[PDB]
Design a protein around this motif. Structure first.
Motif, PDB file in Angstrom:
ATOM      1  N   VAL A 199       4.576   5.006  -8.873  1.00 28.79           N
ATOM      2  CA  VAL A 199       5.857   4.467  -9.355  1.00 28.79           C
ATOM      3  C   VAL A 199       6.851   5.604  -9.640  1.00 28.79           C
ATOM      4  CG1 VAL A 199       7.012   3.176 -11.225  1.00 28.79           C
ATOM      5  CG2 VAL A 199       4.885   2.320 -10.278  1.00 28.79           C
ATOM      6  N   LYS A 200       6.361   6.690 -10.241  1.00 28.80           N
ATOM      7  CA  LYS A 200       7.192   7.857 -10.555  1.00 28.80           C
ATOM      8  C   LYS A 200       7.599   8.623  -9.287  1.00 28.80           C
ATOM      9  CE  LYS A 200       6.919   7.661 -15.192  1.00 28.80           C
ATOM     10  NZ  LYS A 200       8.063   7.723 -16.142  1.00 28.80           N
ATOM     11  N   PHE A 201       6.662   8.785  -8.351  1.00 26.15           N
ATOM     12  CA  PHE A 201       6.915   9.501  -7.088  1.00 26.15           C
ATOM     13  C   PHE A 201       7.852   8.742  -6.140  1.00 26.15           C
ATOM     14  CE2 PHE A 201       5.152  11.476  -2.985  1.00 26.15           C
ATOM     15  CZ  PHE A 201       5.859  12.657  -3.146  1.00 26.15           C
ATOM     16  N   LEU A 202       7.928   7.419  -6.288  1.00 24.06           N
ATOM     17  CA  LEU A 202       8.895   6.602  -5.538  1.00 24.06           C
ATOM     18  C   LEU A 202      10.356   6.869  -5.927  1.00 24.06           C
ATOM     19  CD1 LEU A 202       6.905   3.253  -5.392  1.00 24.06           C
ATOM     20  CD2 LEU A 202       7.814   4.417  -3.370  1.00 24.06           C
ATOM     21  N   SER A 203      10.587   7.378  -7.140  1.00 26.02           N
ATOM     22  CA  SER A 203      11.929   7.813  -7.553  1.00 26.02           C
ATOM     23  C   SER A 203      12.357   9.058  -6.777  1.00 26.02           C
ATOM     24  CB  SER A 203      11.979   8.094  -9.058  1.00 26.02           C
ATOM     25  OG  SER A 203      11.335   9.318  -9.376  1.00 26.02           O
ATOM     26  N   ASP A 255      -1.374   0.694   1.519  1.00 33.56           N
ATOM     27  CA  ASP A 255      -2.128   1.109   0.324  1.00 33.56           C
ATOM     28  C   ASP A 255      -1.253   1.305  -0.915  1.00 33.56           C
ATOM     29  OD1 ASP A 255      -4.162   1.114   2.199  1.00 33.56           O
ATOM     30  OD2 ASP A 255      -5.027   3.016   1.544  1.00 33.56           O
ATOM     31  N   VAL A 256      -0.012   1.756  -0.719  1.00 33.39           N
ATOM     32  CA  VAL A 256       0.961   1.862  -1.814  1.00 33.39           C
ATOM     33  C   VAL A 256       1.320   0.463  -2.326  1.00 33.39           C
ATOM     34  CG1 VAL A 256       3.318   2.564  -2.478  1.00 33.39           C
ATOM     35  CG2 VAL A 256       1.908   4.082  -1.073  1.00 33.39           C
ATOM     36  N   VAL A 257       1.547  -0.469  -1.401  1.00 39.33           N
ATOM     37  CA  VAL A 257       1.860  -1.862  -1.746  1.00 39.33           C
ATOM     38  C   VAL A 257       0.651  -2.562  -2.401  1.00 39.33           C
ATOM     39  CG1 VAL A 257       2.501  -4.139  -0.805  1.00 39.33           C
ATOM     40  CG2 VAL A 257       3.705  -2.080  -0.036  1.00 39.33           C
ATOM     41  N   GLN A 258      -0.552  -2.297  -1.881  1.00 38.35           N
ATOM     42  CA  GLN A 258      -1.792  -2.835  -2.457  1.00 38.35           C
ATOM     43  C   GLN A 258      -2.051  -2.308  -3.870  1.00 38.35           C
ATOM     44  OE1 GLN A 258      -5.177  -2.420   0.350  1.00 38.35           O
ATOM     45  NE2 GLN A 258      -3.664  -2.685   1.992  1.00 38.35           N
ATOM     46  N   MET A 259      -1.943  -0.991  -4.040  1.00 37.08           N
ATOM     47  CA  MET A 259      -2.161  -0.340  -5.343  1.00 37.08           C
ATOM     48  C   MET A 259      -1.167  -0.806  -6.410  1.00 37.08           C
ATOM     49  SD  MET A 259      -4.612   2.171  -5.859  1.00 37.08           S
ATOM     50  CE  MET A 259      -3.895   3.584  -6.698  1.00 37.08           C
ATOM     51  N   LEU A 260       0.103  -0.945  -6.028  1.00 36.37           N
ATOM     52  CA  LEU A 260       1.137  -1.457  -6.934  1.00 36.37           C
ATOM     53  C   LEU A 260       0.926  -2.928  -7.314  1.00 36.37           C
ATOM     54  CD1 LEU A 260       4.214   0.286  -5.289  1.00 36.37           C
ATOM     55  CD2 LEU A 260       3.446   0.681  -7.637  1.00 36.37           C
ATOM     56  N   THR A 261       0.342  -3.717  -6.407  1.00 38.87           N
ATOM     57  CA  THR A 261      -0.008  -5.110  -6.701  1.00 38.87           C
ATOM     58  C   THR A 261      -1.151  -5.205  -7.722  1.00 38.87           C
ATOM     59  OG1 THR A 261       0.637  -5.754  -4.445  1.00 38.87           O
ATOM     60  CG2 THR A 261      -0.617  -7.374  -5.740  1.00 38.87           C
ATOM     61  N   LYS A 262      -2.178  -4.370  -7.552  1.00 34.25           N
ATOM     62  CA  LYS A 262      -3.256  -4.244  -8.548  1.00 34.25           C
ATOM     63  C   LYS A 262      -2.736  -3.743  -9.900  1.00 34.25           C
ATOM     64  CE  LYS A 262      -6.401  -4.274  -4.902  1.00 34.25           C
ATOM     65  NZ  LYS A 262      -6.192  -3.975  -3.458  1.00 34.25           N
ATOM     66  N   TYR A 263      -1.794  -2.802  -9.860  1.00 30.68           N
ATOM     67  CA  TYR A 263      -1.221  -2.210 -11.072  1.00 30.68           C
ATOM     68  C   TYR A 263      -0.468  -3.224 -11.940  1.00 30.68           C
ATOM     69  CZ  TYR A 263       1.473   0.964 -14.081  1.00 30.68           C
ATOM     70  OH  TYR A 263       2.041   1.603 -15.159  1.00 30.68           O
ATOM     71  N   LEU A 310      -2.094  11.365  -2.452  1.00 32.61           N
ATOM     72  CA  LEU A 310      -2.087  10.749  -3.788  1.00 32.61           C
ATOM     73  C   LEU A 310      -3.050   9.559  -3.863  1.00 32.61           C
ATOM     74  CD1 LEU A 310       1.096  10.317  -5.965  1.00 32.61           C
ATOM     75  CD2 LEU A 310      -0.806   8.685  -6.121  1.00 32.61           C
ATOM     76  N   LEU A 311      -3.121   8.780  -2.783  1.00 37.53           N
ATOM     77  CA  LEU A 311      -4.068   7.657  -2.669  1.00 37.53           C
ATOM     78  C   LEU A 311      -5.526   8.121  -2.562  1.00 37.53           C
ATOM     79  CD1 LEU A 311      -1.903   5.639  -0.155  1.00 37.53           C
ATOM     80  CD2 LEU A 311      -2.488   4.821  -2.451  1.00 37.53           C
ATOM     81  N   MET A 312      -5.756   9.202  -1.813  1.00 37.55           N
ATOM     82  CA  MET A 312      -7.078   9.850  -1.734  1.00 37.55           C
ATOM     83  C   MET A 312      -7.577  10.327  -3.100  1.00 37.55           C
ATOM     84  SD  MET A 312      -6.517  12.165   1.690  1.00 37.55           S
ATOM     85  CE  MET A 312      -6.392  11.421   3.315  1.00 37.55           C
ATOM     86  N   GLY A 313      -6.651  10.816  -3.924  1.00 40.08           N
ATOM     87  CA  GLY A 313      -6.964  11.418  -5.221  1.00 40.08           C
ATOM     88  C   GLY A 313      -7.026  12.934  -5.182  1.00 40.08           C
ATOM     89  N   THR A 314      -6.253  13.545  -4.282  1.00 42.09           N
ATOM     90  CA  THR A 314      -6.171  15.004  -4.180  1.00 42.09           C
ATOM     91  C   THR A 314      -5.268  15.591  -5.270  1.00 42.09           C
ATOM     92  OG1 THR A 314      -4.326  14.977  -2.581  1.00 42.09           O
ATOM     93  CG2 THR A 314      -6.570  14.936  -1.680  1.00 42.09           C
ATOM     94  N   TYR A 315      -4.350  14.776  -5.800  1.00 38.85           N
ATOM     95  CA  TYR A 315      -3.428  15.193  -6.862  1.00 38.85           C
ATOM     96  C   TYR A 315      -3.695  14.447  -8.180  1.00 38.85           C
ATOM     97  CZ  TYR A 315      -1.122  16.506  -2.462  1.00 38.85           C
ATOM     98  OH  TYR A 315      -0.843  16.992  -1.205  1.00 38.85           O
ATOM     99  N   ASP A 332      -3.850   5.704 -13.357  1.00 36.78           N
ATOM    100  CA  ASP A 332      -3.338   7.088 -13.285  1.00 36.78           C
ATOM    101  C   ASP A 332      -2.636   7.396 -11.959  1.00 36.78           C
ATOM    102  OD1 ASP A 332      -4.756   7.190 -15.709  1.00 36.78           O
ATOM    103  OD2 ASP A 332      -5.384   9.265 -15.384  1.00 36.78           O
ATOM    104  N   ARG A 333      -3.202   6.906 -10.856  1.00 33.56           N
ATOM    105  CA  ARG A 333      -2.590   7.051  -9.529  1.00 33.56           C
ATOM    106  C   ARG A 333      -1.373   6.142  -9.360  1.00 33.56           C
ATOM    107  NH1 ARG A 333      -8.270   6.972  -5.940  1.00 33.56           N
ATOM    108  NH2 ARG A 333      -9.067   8.960  -6.778  1.00 33.56           N
ATOM    109  N   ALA A 334      -1.511   4.878  -9.764  1.00 32.88           N
ATOM    110  CA  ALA A 334      -0.429   3.891  -9.642  1.00 32.88           C
ATOM    111  C   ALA A 334       0.791   4.234 -10.497  1.00 32.88           C
ATOM    112  CB  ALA A 334      -0.936   2.499  -9.982  1.00 32.88           C
ATOM    113  N   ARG A 335       0.558   4.775 -11.695  1.00 26.95           N
ATOM    114  CA  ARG A 335       1.645   5.295 -12.537  1.00 26.95           C
ATOM    115  C   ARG A 335       2.380   6.443 -11.843  1.00 26.95           C
ATOM    116  NH1 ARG A 335       2.550   4.332 -17.751  1.00 26.95           N
ATOM    117  NH2 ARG A 335       2.917   6.531 -18.281  1.00 26.95           N
TER     118      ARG A 335
END
Lengths: 274, 146, 66, 120, 246, 273, 114, 118
Positions: free
Chosen positions: G42-46, G4-12, G75-80, G36-39
């Motif tokens: 990218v930041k949380f991957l740091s 889902d992280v890889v999928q979301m970043l591909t859409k982004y 983060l993918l669910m949208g809890t944050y 908003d989640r994909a941004r």
């Protein structure tokens, strides 16, 4: 052959070390001839010499989607078309990541089964209109076209019966009311389980999905045929109505923690098993 | 040098011009009469030399052509601008055809707004609901019989 | 209770209430065409602070706020 | 003065890539004034050579160092914003610019009077 | 290295063309919907002319209502209206523009005169209610005035977007000009118009003023919307040719 | 070494003339080895062998900002980062034209002075946010723009005169001061002094004319109980007097021969730090 | 979760090309929430490394496998979604994100009051 | 004649972009007639091949050079304006066009008579 790219590099080493004059990308003059005499030995013999065959699946690695490389361009000109695997489709979700626009089979129509030729001829018309309309309000092609894309995702290979029936359902429009995310759950419940027999509205005399032996009857007669057409359209009508009523009703319901996650883990496992 | 005003590009028995919003439904069409309603009852507009401005209530029109045929509308508001020459321009805000309206939905909508009158916000907001009922009663009336 | 004029509310707001009522009485088959010449879909605002528009709220916009 | 011409032309090459993508109207209010001056700077950098009278079909211009610095200085200030763009193309110093701008004003006045002659 | 990057530059422009072509094709649909108007038009504001048509040409607040576009890439249209505001600019001045570009551009260029601006998301068509919302906001925080000018974009042809205006004098000034027209050989065009209007009661004359003012604005915004989609068609098809040349 | 590009060309001539097999861009096989054994001899020795050093500043010319050239890519992989000089920044105004995004020091933090490490750690956070926000006015946007104006200089600055003018911008003493008048603000800080000029001085030790404080700052830093209160007086006196007496003229002067006089003043202030 | 992280970043990356051409406001309602989640992804991957304390100027973070999977899952669910973007930049797991978000809320409250 | 076919097809591609934007009714009186001819030119350029009898399911057509020039010349003049569009599709020479147009007139007369009854 996995893969001819590394064979060419090995042949280049041999040629260069023995002072054979190099040409394009340091390969020798006969690097085309290397792959050509290999792949031409793969063939379909005549009735006069047994009618046997050697089918060839040469793999050739490209560097950053560059088809203009010398070894890649050589093998494309020898083979009967290709199956292009795009990197963006892989990461995007579609697996296998088959770029249908770039891919091509030069002897496709004659190669297919009589049953598979029936459904697939229509799919070319639907996906052509879907791809155009996606670039430039949902039509019938837009609905049914999107479901095909969801169906093409699979890890392990599908059996001929289980594939063609799930495609035939989408062709005649049995997955129109079914949403795009629940196509793999719809397809799983078609193949392994069965909703008609799941105590109630069954009453089919022969056609079911648990009977895997019907595979070879379908290959002979096709789905569009007086023997199987009416019996098949019952199976799908029972499966859709019961799935929409009993199984898809949950999605309006499930809006809670530990049920939304349970729905996800169910749907993600359905991508693997066709 | 200076800005040309917006009217400069427009150009130009009885002949009326019935419009709505910013587009005509009829354009200078020859006609025997037309019958509006507003302020001082239903003054039927005929061929004459009068020149008269008439404000409109939520009420129907009836466009009777010289031959005999009839085409009825229903209006929300606006005015009717009669000229010295045999012509007028009935500039409405909305001019629906008396056919596009429904008898069953209108009477259903009357029952809904009467309930809102009782439990209104205040006497300011309650007057706005009475405008809504005043249209609905006129809508149902123009459908029935006439 | 009765007089819309005596509780403020200009002639133009009355016309909007009159049209919006006349659009709500349209037949089911062809009501979409008429509703787009009435349905409120606009606001008044100005930028303040940094990319944070105020929204003025003076002219009512909607029918029930008249 | 020489640095400001180099600075303005550097900004202009960045703005030229934006106009090709977006458009001339998409630029900001201050950036439009930079383009009007920078376009005139590119035109004013051209010069009819005395050896190239056969090519250009116009007499040459030896432009003095004091003339070159003063004319370009005023253009950067924005003293010649109301002066048209084609006045600066293929001339020497500021006197020849204002001379060509006078000829452009006079010829434009004559052609306008020709199209104003007919009425009704 | 160079083989990959020049391809990725070329792949960039391919995505650019496809996205800009989506705007082109979407604005054609809006232009087809919008041109359902040119056949009609004009005859709706016949008697609006007799009310507000000034012959030609600052003591107590001059309001200006320039009708601008939402998102850019329309071209010489928002810039054209800014030139009209910069040309007039008297001491007694106050601005209430219409559109997101007007809000952004006039706020920075004229922080003293700019009060606030109106936005329409262009979801439904340009209707009377929108025009009343403009007229009623034009005297709310801006209050009374000498006149309310409405700068807009006329649409005569697909290539030619003309820049035009409607002048609405205030009711006190308007009634004085009307009284002159009613009882004098001066004016002539509105001799029996003013007599027929003044014979009616005082609320009717005030509601006639409000009505035709909103009707004058309704034309301006609707004409600007038609100019907006046409000019953007030329700018976007210009953008495509720029992308294709690259 | 000014420069290793021309050394490589000289070594290529030697290799090619003696029939050494050429490879990429006609250079020999060992053109990497040429620069590698040179630059590795530059080092920082241990306490056991004197603790001496040879610092290396190899220059390498690029053709039209192309880092993918063979000789350039070789030297980048050997050295401990680079100082990239962009052609567009040079013509744009920034001199030295140091592209901070492209440039890098692989051993930066440990190399700096204790005082310089204090101010510079914050500047990385400010310029990171300024560069991002410039693409897409906050306090970082104001203070970030002043740093860019301060980085312009012809001749090299003394350590005291540099760090104080950067410390002023860090804590936000040049926020009310406009971007064009930062060099005039910095000039009047270093050479002149406004507190001693007008009246309101009364500092016991810390002034800018006393250049010997340089080495006390290097020991104790600016953020320290010895110099913090005394420094913040100097800057408070300099800002208030500059804004009141010196910056008041710029609202005034809107005439010919005064706008030009303002320019010629401000342009000469870019040279002297 | 990893897919889902890889999928979301591909859409982004596809959406990033659309925002450059059209604009941030032009996107759909659901697509804005993906950005908003994909941004934040990218930041949380740091991550601030423990050996790189000299470079980053902050102490390191060893993030556990159970922490990594759970924090990214939420983060993918949208809890944050209500958690700000710069809270996720250069931190370890979810406890350090919510710690930095608390510090951002407190410092933003002080500067707003002044 | 050959240049006029190339010229007309070039005008047709420009008009095809206008119909997509504006509409078929928005075009001029003369331009509508150019579209009717140009549409027929595109259809008349098609030809059933003699080797491709298996594919097309119709007999082949060798069209003579004199037939090709004369038939296309008359279409540009507007001598075959009243001839329907699908008559020109997949035929060879003017005799086969008028033959198919006769068959289309007869079959259209029969199907119209069926609906003039039910």
């Amino acid at each position: 052959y996995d893969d001819l790219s590394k064979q060419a590099v090995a042949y280049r080493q041999i040629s260069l070390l023995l002072r054979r004059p190099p040409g394009r990308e340091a390969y020798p003059g006969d690097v085309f001839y290397l792959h050509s005499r290999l792949l031409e030995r793969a063939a379909m013999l005549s009735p006069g010499k047994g009618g046997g065959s050697v089918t060839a699946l040469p793999i050739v690695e490209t560097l950053s989607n560059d088809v203009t490389a010398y070894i890649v361009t050589n093998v494309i000109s020898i083979t009967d078309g290709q199956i292009y695997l795009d990197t963006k489709l892989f990461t995007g979700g579609q697996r296998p990541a088959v770029n249908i626009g770039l891919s091509v089979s030069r002897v496709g129509s004659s190669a297919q089964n009589a049953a598979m030729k029936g459904v697939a001829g229509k799919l070319k018309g639907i996906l052509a209109e879907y791809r155009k309309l996606a670039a430039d309000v949902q039509t019938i092609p837009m609905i049914r076209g999107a479901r095909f894309v969801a169906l093409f995702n699979q890890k392990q290979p599908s059996y001929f019966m289980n594939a063609i029936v799930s495609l035939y359902a989408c062709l005649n429009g049995y997955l129109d009311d079914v949403k795009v995310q629940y196509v793999k759950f719809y397809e799983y419940l078609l193949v392994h389980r069965d909703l008609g027999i799941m105590y109630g509205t069954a009453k089919n005399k022969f056609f079911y999905m648990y009977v895997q032996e019907l595979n070879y009857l379908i290959r002979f007669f096709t789905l569009n045929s007086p023997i199987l057409h009416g019996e098949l359209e019952e199976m799908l009508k029972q499966h859709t109505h019961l799935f929409l009523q009993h199984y898809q009703s949950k999605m309006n319901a499930i809006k809670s923690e530990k049920d939304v996650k349970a729905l996800k883990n169910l749907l993600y496992s359905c991508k693997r098993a066709v | 040098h200076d800005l040309p005003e917006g009217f400069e590009f427009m150009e130009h028995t009885l002949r009326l011009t019935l419009t709505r919003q910013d587009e005509f439904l009829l354009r200078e069409e020859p006609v025997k009469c037309v019958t509006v309603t507003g302020t001082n009852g239903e003054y039927g507009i005929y061929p004459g030399h009068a020149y008269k401005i008439v404000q409109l209530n939520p009420s129907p029109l009836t466009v009777e052509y010289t031959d005999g045929t009839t085409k009825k509308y229903f209006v929300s508001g606006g005015f009717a601008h009669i000229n010295n020459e045999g012509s007028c321009d009935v500039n409405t805000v909305e001019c629906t055809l008396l056919d596009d309206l429904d008898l069953a939905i209108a009477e259903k909508e009357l029952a809904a707004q009467q309930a809102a009158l009782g439990s209104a916000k205040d006497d300011k907001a309650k007057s706005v609901v009475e405008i809504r009922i005043s249209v609905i009663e006129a809508v149902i009336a123009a459908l029935k019989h006439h | 209770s009765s007089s819309w004029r005596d509780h403020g509310i200009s002639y133009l707001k009355y016309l909007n209430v009159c049209t919006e009522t006349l659009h709500s009485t349209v037949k089911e088959s062809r009501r979409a065409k008429y509703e787009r010449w009435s349905k409120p879909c606009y606001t008044a605002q100005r930028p303040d602070g940094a990319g944070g528009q105020e929204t003025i709220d003076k002219v009512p916009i909607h029918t029930k706020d008249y | 003065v020489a640095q400001d011409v180099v600075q303005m032309l550097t900004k202009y090459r960045e703005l030229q890539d934006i106009i090709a993508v977006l458009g001339i109207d998409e630029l900001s209010e201050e950036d439009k004034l930079i383009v009007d001056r920078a376009r005139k700077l590119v035109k004013f950098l051209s010069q009819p050579f005395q050896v190239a009278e056969v090519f250009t079909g116009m007499t040459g211009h030896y432009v003095q160092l004091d003339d070159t610095i003063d004319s370009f200085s005023g253009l950067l200030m924005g003293t010649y914003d109301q002066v048209p763009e084609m006045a600066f193309y293929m001339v020497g110093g500021i006197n020849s610019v204002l001379e060509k701008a006078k000829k452009m004003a006079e010829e434009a006045a004559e052609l306008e009077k020709m199209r104003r002659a007919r009425v009704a | 290295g160079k083989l990959r990057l020049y391809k990725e530059k070329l792949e960039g422009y391919n995505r650019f063309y496809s996205i800009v072509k989506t705007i082109k094709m979407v604005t054609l649909a809006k232009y087809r919907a919008a041109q359902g108007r040119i056949r009609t038009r004009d005859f709706s504001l016949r008697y609006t002319e007799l009310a507000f048509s000034k012959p030609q040409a600052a003591k107590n607040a001059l309001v200006y209502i320039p009708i601008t576009t939402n998102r850019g890439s329309c071209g010489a249209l928002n810039s054209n209206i800014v030139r009209c505001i910069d040309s007039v600019v008297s001491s007694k001045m106050v601005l209430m523009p219409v559109g997101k570009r007007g809000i952004d551009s006039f706020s920075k260029l004229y922080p003293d005169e700019f009060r606030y601006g109106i936005i329409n998301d262009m979801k439904e068509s340009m209707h009377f209610g929108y025009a009343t919302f403009v007229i009623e906001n034009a005297y709310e925080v801006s209050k009374d005035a000498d006149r309310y000018q409405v700068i807009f974009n006329r649409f005569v042809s697909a290539g030619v977007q003309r820049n035009a205006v409607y002048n609405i004098p205030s009711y006190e000034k308007w009634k004085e000009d009307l009284a002159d027209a009613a009882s004098s050989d001066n004016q002539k065009n509105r001799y029996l118009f003013a007599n027929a209007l003044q014979n009616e009661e005082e609320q009717l004359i005030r509601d006639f003023f409000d009505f035709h003012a909103a009707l004058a604005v309704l034309n301006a915004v609707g004409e600007n919307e038609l100019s907006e989609q046409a000019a953007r068609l030329v700018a976007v098809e210009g953008q495509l040719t720029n992308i294709s040349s690259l």
